[PDB]
Structures are given as C-alpha cells and as structure tokens.
Design a protein around this ligand. Structure first.
Ligand SMILES: Nc1ncnc2c1ncn2[C@@H]1O[C@H](COP(=O)(O)OP(=O)(O)OP(=O)(O)O)[C@@H](O)[C@H]1O
Ligand SMILES: Nc1ncnc2c1ncn2[C@@H]1O[C@H](COP(=O)(O)OP(=O)(O)OP(=O)(O)O)[C@@H](O)[C@H]1O
Ligand SMILES: [Mg+2]
Ligand SMILES: [Mg+2]
Lengths: 246, 256, 256, 246
C-alpha cells in the first residue's frame, strides 16, 4: 500500500505533461507537445525497440544499451577513484591545500574540450570516450566526499583517536558510515553527469549509442526532428532513474 | 486543573521483531502554579512522559489536555530544558538565549529584549562567556545556558529534564533558588525530572514516582507537607523530611 | 613515578585576547590510586584531564606516564567523555564491541563477544543491546560509555562525570562495580565528580581546583578509610561528616 | 607567512607540469607539452590579451569575459532557484516524493541535447544560451540542498519546534546556518557546471566568447590547434578558481 510514494509521482507527472501541451497553444512555441511528440515517433520507435535496419540504425533499444556500457564503465571508475581520492584528500589538510587549484582548474573543462585532448592521449578513440565520461562525472563524487570527511563531528574522531583506529580500519568504521549522505549525494550527481556528457563522449565512435543518435538528429533538421531527441531524452532519464535507485 | 493526562500509553515500533511498551495508563492532574517532580529509574520513561506533555511526542492511545484544549504540537508556553541541552553550535551564549526570547516577545523595541537576555545570563552566571560558542563551553556551562533561554520566555508550563545534572554543589544549590521564586513570583507550573532526592523534596509539591521496566505506570504521588518558602536549611530540620526521603529510597530499592 | 603532571598550563586564544584556564598544576598519581577531581562548573576539570588522556596539548608544561611524555591519545588511557560520544549508526552492543575489537584483535569471536555481553549486563543494558543511541535515554547512553571503557580495562581510567544522569540506586550499583574492577586489576582511575558524597566513597585522594580563570590545585585531601569501603558504614566513621563539609567549605569559599 | 597554503599549490603544480612534459617523450603521445603549448600560443595570445583584429577574433580577454557574463547570469539564476527549491523540496517530504522522478529524468539531459529544445521554446537564441547554462548548473545546488535539509539534526528541529519558528524565520535561522556545508558544496559544483556547458551554450551566438573559440578551433585542425584549446582551458580554470573562492 504505497499511496504516498507511487501516486504523487504520477500526480506530479500529470503536471508538466498537460501544461506542456498548453504551452504549445502559443503559436511561437515551436517545441512539439506530448501528443505530437508521442505520435510522430510512435510508429518506428515507440511501437518496438531492439530492431536492426543495417548500418547504425538500431532504433533505441541498442542505442541506450550501447551507451549504458560506456557510462557504466566511466562512472564505476570515477566512483571508485572519486571516493578513494576524496577520503585521502579529506584527511591530511596539507594534501588538500596541496592539490586544491589543479583540481578546480581541471574540473571546468567541458567534455567537448576534452574530446581533442583525449584523442591525442589515447590513440584508439575507444577508451577516449570512457575518459570523457570518467573525467566529467568524478568531481561531484570527489568534492562531496572531501567535504563530508572534513565535516565529520569531533565526537566520532575522539572515539577513533582513543582506540587504535587508523588506516583501513579508520576509514571502514568511522569515515565511511559518518559520511554516507555526502558520498551518496556525490554519486547521485555523478550519475547524472555521466549521461550529461554522453553526446560529447560518443562523438569518437560509430553511430550506435544514445548521444550519436542525439547528435546526428540535431544536425539533420526534419519534420520528426525534435520528437526523436525528446523521446531519446526520456529513455535516458528513465535509465538514469533506475541507476539512481540502485 | 491546569494540565491533565487521561490515559497516555506510549508504544514504540522497534521494527525488527519487537514491540516495546515504554508507558501505559498514566493518570495525572497538575494544578496551576504547582511544582511536580518526576523521579524514577534511568530509562523507565521519565523523558518520554515529559515529552508527551511538551508536545514533542505523540501518545499512541490517550491524550494530554492543557486548560481544556488538547496538546498536539510544541508551543513556546511549554518551553523545555532538553537533556542534551540542544544548543546551536553557530550561536554564542548570548545569541542562544537571544533566539529563545525573540519570538515569544516580538514587538519589544529590541531595547528591553537585550536587557532580558543579559539579566537572565546573570542568573546562571555566564557573563564572562556570553561571546563563546557551545564548542568552547563545558558540560555544566552548556546546561546553564539551556535553562537560561527557557526561563527568559516565562512559560505558563515549564518542563525540566535533568536541569542540574552537570552542576556542582554551590551552583546547583544557587540555581535551585531563582527557580522557585520565578515559580512563586510568576504563576509558573513546573514539571521536573530529577535523579537527586535531596532536591526533589526542596522544590516539588508532590513527587510522581514512576515504575521501573516496560509498561511503566505511576507508582506513588506522595506529597511534601512543607511550607512553600524553603531555604534548603530548615526543610531538612523537619521531622517529616527524612520520612519522605527514606520513602523515596524505599520504592527505588524495590524496583531493582 | 607513575603519572606526573609537571606545571602544565592552558591558554585559549580568543578574539578578545588570551584566556587562561590552567596555571601551574602539579600532580603525582601513583599506580593503582583512585583520584576524584571536584570543583566548580567551568573551572577546568575537563581541560586538566584532557591532557592526561592526550586530547589537549598543554600550552606550557608536560604530562608524563611512567617517565614518558603524553602527546597522543591511546587505548591504555581510555576516557569516558562527558557528552557520551557514541556512534549513532551502531547499537549498544556494537558500540562496546568497537572498542573491544580495536584494542585487542588477537583472540577470535565468541571470546571477545562474551566480554561485550558481560559488560552490558554489568551496567544493566542487557535488554537494550539491539537499539541505536537515538532509541535509548540519556542515562542509558551513559552506561554504554561506561561499558565501552570498562571492557578495554585500560592501564589508567579517566572519567568525566560518569554517573551524572543515573538514579541513586543505579549510580550506587555502578560505583561498587567500578570499585570491584578497580581492585582486581592495576587500573588507576582519574574521576570527575560533582557529588561530594561520591568522591569520598571512592577516591583515595580528593583534588579541588579553584574557580575562575587561572585555576590551580588548592587543598588536596587524603581519604583515610579501609579499602573495602561500603555504604551505611563509611558515614558512621568519625572521619566522615567533617571531611565532607571541608569540601563544601572550599566550594562555597571559592565563590567571588 | 603563507608557507603551507600558497607554497604547496605551487609545489603540487610542479608535478603534472613536468610529468606532462615527460609524458610527451613517448612518440605515441600526440598531446603538446607545456613548453610547446606555451610557445606556439605565446606570440599572439600570451604576449597580450584584449587585442581586436576583427569580429570573432577579439583575442582572449573578451572571449573569457563574454562567456563570463553568460555563465554569471546563468549561475545566479540557478543558484537562487536551486537554493530556494532545495529548501522547499527539502522540507515537506510529500513534495519531495511528488517531484522525485521528473527532476531525475530532467537532470540527465546533456547540454547539447538542450540546444534544440531551448531554440524551440525561446525563439531569440540569446536567452536560450542562458537557459542551457541555468538548467545544467542547478541540480547539484538542488540535490545538495535537499540532502542537507533532510540531514538537519533533530536537536535543531526540536529547538525550532518548541519556539514559534516556521516559514521564513525557520529558514534563515535554522535551515540555512545548519546546511552551510551542503549548500556551499553544491554551489562549488554548480560553478564547475556553468563552465562545463559553455561550449554547447555558445553554439547559438556569435564567435565571441570562450566556447566558440573552443568549438571552431576543434573543427579546424592547424599546427597550433591543441595548444590553443589547452591555453583557453587554463584561462577558464583560473577564472573558475577565482569564482570558486567567492
Ligand atoms: N576550546 C575552548 N576555547 C575557549 N575556552 C574554552 C575552550 N574549552 C574550554 N574552555 C573554557 O575553559 C573553562 C573550563 O572548561 P572545562 O570544560 O574544563 O570545564 P569543567 O569545569 O571541567 O566543566 P563542568 O562544567 O562539566 O564542571 C571554561 O571557562 C570554558 O569556557
Ligand atoms: N524510539 C525509541 N525506540 C525504542 N525504544 C525507545 C525509543 N525511545 C525511547 N525508548 C525506550 O523507552 C524508554 C523511555 O526512555 P526515557 O528517555 O523516557 O527514560 P528516562 O527515565 O527519562 O531516562 P534517564 O533517567 O536515563 O534519562 C527507555 O527504556 C528507552 O530505551
Ligand atoms: Mg531521558
Ligand atoms: Mg566538562
């Protein structure tokens, strides 16, 4: 009996779905409404995913699955690296003061700007896409973990100081359980940034994968142009929603 | 009657395979201006019962009535001295008391409000530390500012949860005074949770004695027949003083 | 010879200038002694014992344990914090088990597990072994810290008001248990008490500190009673009821 | 006497600056080193910024300032919107459960995918670029604020409940001072996202501004191609570093 956890999402989904339709009543609003969006792409895509038409036309089932393995590998590496680095940076404030700026200046680089740099570093262009995902969705995990460790109450540290809790024992018994909201919120933001940089990351691979489907649909302006990308974004959000609740 | 309790019965879920009954069938009537102590064993339900009167806790079955209206939410006329002192670490001693008396007395020209804060700091003797954060205080020092902000609001009903636990002999005795005269000068009814028998008899008019263990109920409501003006010296000289004191220790021993 | 405090002092940098807490405290605590440190609230009892536990570096001075300077907290100097520092994500059983496993991991499970179980029964939190600190009362929080400290059985015990939030029956029961484990081993106990009756019953020597800034040790006493002290008999001796009011005399004289 | 706050950043700056040069000893590493990056772009760019040689060729000072005025308005709107919302959704868990999914699915949208949607909604392309910056750098501010409010200790709530603290006074006296590490961490991440989507955002405006300079240098390959974008990223990072310490 979930009447306050499954129904309010649907009630809230009613808004932003009807007012979106009413927003199209303005003639200047060229964005297609839910009726137009879900009917123009209904026949080839919404009817059935997982269909192959040769070349790279794989509908949307394979496009969201091919990019899922790219963001999954990129986020997993960034989650591991971000958490370990954040804990190490959170302790030893001299180290945090040591690499403070070269982490700040390196986290403002757009993924599109990472595209040529990663090409030169990795001359395969297959792991280059992984690096763009990894280097983009790592700072929210790194920053939140670092702030979480720095905000540990002195009461827990005093308990750790009296006992011989240092090293792996200190991190697994004091640092991690205390900084649960910070680390998991960083992972939550990191999940969104992995998908936020998939269009740029998949600019070096074939036409299979969501992000290549978005890119070439944006370049080619057709009648069913905006509807195709909007449906792709919905698929990304739903997949990112399941990844969030995990 | 001023505050009355019909049939409060607190049940805690304990999600994994249990059902804890902290309280059951508590009947108690407190008249206006009366000082009531709530002595008992540690972990028997003194704070849980005290919180229900305050409104921070909701009774499962039953209710608490205050002046004919049901209690269902915390209110400034029921200020509570929290056992953990619930201090705000980003505010100084003066600011912690200031936060308390700024909403109860809105529209006071900000001139009298400063005087109220300062003179209540005088009562607990924290003048030399009004600019210190709770992180740079002591346990007893943190307790005094907790009661300083509670007395500044002049509640109709005052709820005290171990207000003198972390105080030494002189300060606790000195702070026992300036509390009964506020209850005397202003029409303040006080419900106090204490573990010191020698101070329960000095302050209270009757002593509510809870029962140890789960499903706690009110054991005895024995009252002190001592004159209201008390100076902690002649009250001991009363022949009945020791008789009540040994009665308190008697019931506490039988609950072992 | 065992624990030497050599002219330590504490200066706290404040925005209004320097604040002096400690000034020229000297102590010579021998192995196995029981010392109760009493005084006013905010005089520096917690600050003085913090340096012995290693939580506070003296501004000018040094503390030696067996001819070795103290600079970092250790498990042989276990402390009972005044705020009862407990991890909210652990149970009462897990809070005690954390200290047991950390200070000696050599022996396997079902042996260090029994050490935790017996110490919870010693303080009486047998039923409260699966609930978080948010589900236990303040006095029950206190006994978790006591059980956590007693399980390690350190070389020297430092207690900062370990019986503040306990009733008379429970407090007296834990005093006897603290004494029993104090004699069966070589534990040196440094205890802070706000109750004069408590210090005389336990301590071999009672130390008082003057109030206000620049607090130094004044009028250290000795407690000449037979080692197996028992209640209802230590008060019968003529050496009681005159040492007690001597302590009250100093506490009341330190005011102003 | 800043010996452990200014010196360690420069000591840590030596690393990643000499190993970067040492990484170019490998012939397979086509990325330019620090010496050639700071020499190829030395004459026209590093010698003097703020030089105007025609439209879309306004050196680098105007490029880093035209984009600064775009992210400044975008981040300010997102900072206000995220904080005010994060408090509102942070309290009232029914509202948080109500719009949980429509925010998760709306925060995985890449800024490049927001480009066609913004044009359709805003047929001016001037505020549409601001919308891309605003909608991208708002979720870390929103997510951290909601987590911070949800993690407010019950002791502070109890003090606010006993007193008549509710509404504006409750937010400015309890919610905000307690949730300082959470809100400010989100703002720091939000600053990084404003510069993270500046290349995509300026795809609809003229050639002035960083992001247009990055894009057109990536499309056209020259001898000083990778060096120019690396120098531009350094300017963005230093500006972001100044904005971070604010
Ligand atoms: N970090 C600090 N900064 C400034 N002053 C401090 C700091 N810690 C303690 N003090 C001051 O030191 C004095 C004594 O502190 P301490 O905690 O030792 O008191 P106490 O007498 O042991 O406590 P209790 O009230 O429990 O008896 C107080 O005036 C307090 O304000
Ligand atoms: N949320 C909860 N879940 C389970 N049990 C709880 C919860 N809150 C309180 N209890 C239990 O119910 C009883 C109520 O505790 P309470 O704080 O009222 O005791 P107390 O007599 O005031 O304690 P003390 O004298 O130690 O301060 C205790 O046994 C406590 O362990
Ligand atoms: Mg309690
Ligand atoms: Mg103290």
């Amino acid at each position: 009996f979930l009447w306050k956890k499954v129904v309010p999402p649907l009630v809230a989904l009613g808004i932003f779905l009807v007012i979106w339709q009413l927003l199209c009543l303005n003639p200047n609003f060229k964005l297609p409404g839910p009726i137009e969006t879900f009917s123009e792409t209904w026949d080839p895509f919404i009817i059935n995913p997982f269909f192959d038409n040769g070349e790279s036309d794989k509908g949307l089932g394979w496009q969201i699955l091919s990019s899922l393995g790219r963001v999954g590998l990129g986020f997993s590496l960034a989650a591991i690296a971000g958490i370990i680095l954040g804990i190490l940076i959170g302790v030893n404030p001299l180290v945090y003061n040591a690499v403070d700026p070269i982490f700040q200046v390196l986290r403002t680089v757009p993924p599109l700007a990472w595209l040529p740099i990663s090409l030169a570093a990795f001359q395969q262009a297959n792991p280059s896409a992984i690096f763009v995902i990894f280097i983009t969705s790592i700072w929210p995990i790194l920053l939140n973990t670092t702030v979480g460790v720095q905000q540990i109450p002195q009461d827990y540290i005093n308990v750790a100081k009296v006992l011989r809790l240092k090293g792996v024992k200190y991190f697994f018994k004091i640092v991690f359980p205390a900084t649960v909201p910070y680390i998991f919120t960083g992972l939550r933001i990191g999940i969104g940034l992995s998908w936020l940089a998939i269009v740029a990351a998949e600019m070096l691979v074939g036409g299979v994968g969501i992000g290549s489907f978005i890119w070439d649909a944006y370049n080619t302006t057709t009648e069913t142009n905006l509807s195709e990308i909007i449906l792709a974004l919905i698929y990304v959000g739903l997949v990112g929603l399941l990844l969030d609740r995990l | 009657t001023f505050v009355e309790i019909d049939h409060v019965d607190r049940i805690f879920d304990l999600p994994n395979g249990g059902r804890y009954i902290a309280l059951k069938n508590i009947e108690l009537k407190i008249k206006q201006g009366e000082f009531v102590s709530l002595i008992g064993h540690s972990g028997c339900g003194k704070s849980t019962l005290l919180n229900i009167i305050a409104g921070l806790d909701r009774a499962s079955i039953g209710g608490v009535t205050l002046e004919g209206r049901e209690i269902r939410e915390p209110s400034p006329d029921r200020m509570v001295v929290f056992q953990n002192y619930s201090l705000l670490p980003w505010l100084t001693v003066r600011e912690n008391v200031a936060l308390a008396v700024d909403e109860v007395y809105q529209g006071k020209s900000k001139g009298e409000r400063r005087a109220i804060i300062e003179e209540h700091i005088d009562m607990v003797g924290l003048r030399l530390a009004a600019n210190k954060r709770p992180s740079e205080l002591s346990g007893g020092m943190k307790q005094r500012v907790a009661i300083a902000r509670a007395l500044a609001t002049r509640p109709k009903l005052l709820l005290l949860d171990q207000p003198f636990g972390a105080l030494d002999a002189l300060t606790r005795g000195s702070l026992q005074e300036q509390l009964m005269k506020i209850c005397n000068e202003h029409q303040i009814t006080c419900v106090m949770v204490t573990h010191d028998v020698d101070e329960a008899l000095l302050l209270s008019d009757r002593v509510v004695m809870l029962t140890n263990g789960p499903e706690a109920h009110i054991g005895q409501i024995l009252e002190v027949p001592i004159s209201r003006p008390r100076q902690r010296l002649e009250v001991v000289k009363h022949p009945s003083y020791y008789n009540l004191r040994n009665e308190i220790i008697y019931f506490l021993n039988q609950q072992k | 010879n065992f624990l030497v405090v050599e002219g330590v002092s504490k200066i706290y940098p404040t925005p209004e200038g320097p604040y002096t807490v400690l000034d020229g405290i000297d102590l010579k605590v021998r192995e196995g002694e029981f010392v109760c440190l009493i005084g006013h609230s905010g005089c520096g009892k917690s600050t003085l014992l913090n340096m012995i536990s290693g939580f506070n570096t003296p501004s000018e001075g040094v503390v030696l344990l067996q001819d070795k300077p103290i600079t970092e907290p250790g498990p042989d100097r276990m402390m009972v914090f005044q705020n009862y520092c407990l991890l909210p994500w652990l149970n009462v059983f897990e809070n005690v088990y954390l200290a047991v496993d950390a200070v000696f991991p050599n022996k396997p499970q079902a042996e260090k597990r029994a050490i935790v179980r017996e110490h919870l029964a010693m303080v009486g939190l047998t039923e409260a072994a699966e609930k978080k600190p948010s589900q236990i009362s303040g006095g029950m929080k206190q006994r978790v810290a006591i059980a956590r400290a007693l399980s390690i059985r350190p070389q020297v015990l430092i207690l900062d008001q370990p019986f503040g939030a306990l009733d008379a029956i429970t407090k007296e029961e834990l005093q006897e248990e603290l004494l029993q484990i104090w004699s069966d081993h070589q534990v040196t106990v440094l205890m802070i008490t706000h109750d004069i009756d408590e210090a005389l019953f336990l301590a071999d020597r009672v130390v008082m500190m003057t109030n206000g800034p620049a607090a130094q040790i004044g009028e250290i006493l000795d407690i000449p009673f037979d080692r197996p002290r028992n209640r209802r008999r230590i008060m019968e001796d003529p050496k009681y009821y005159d040492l007690r009011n001597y302590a009250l005399d100093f506490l009341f004289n330190r005011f102003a």
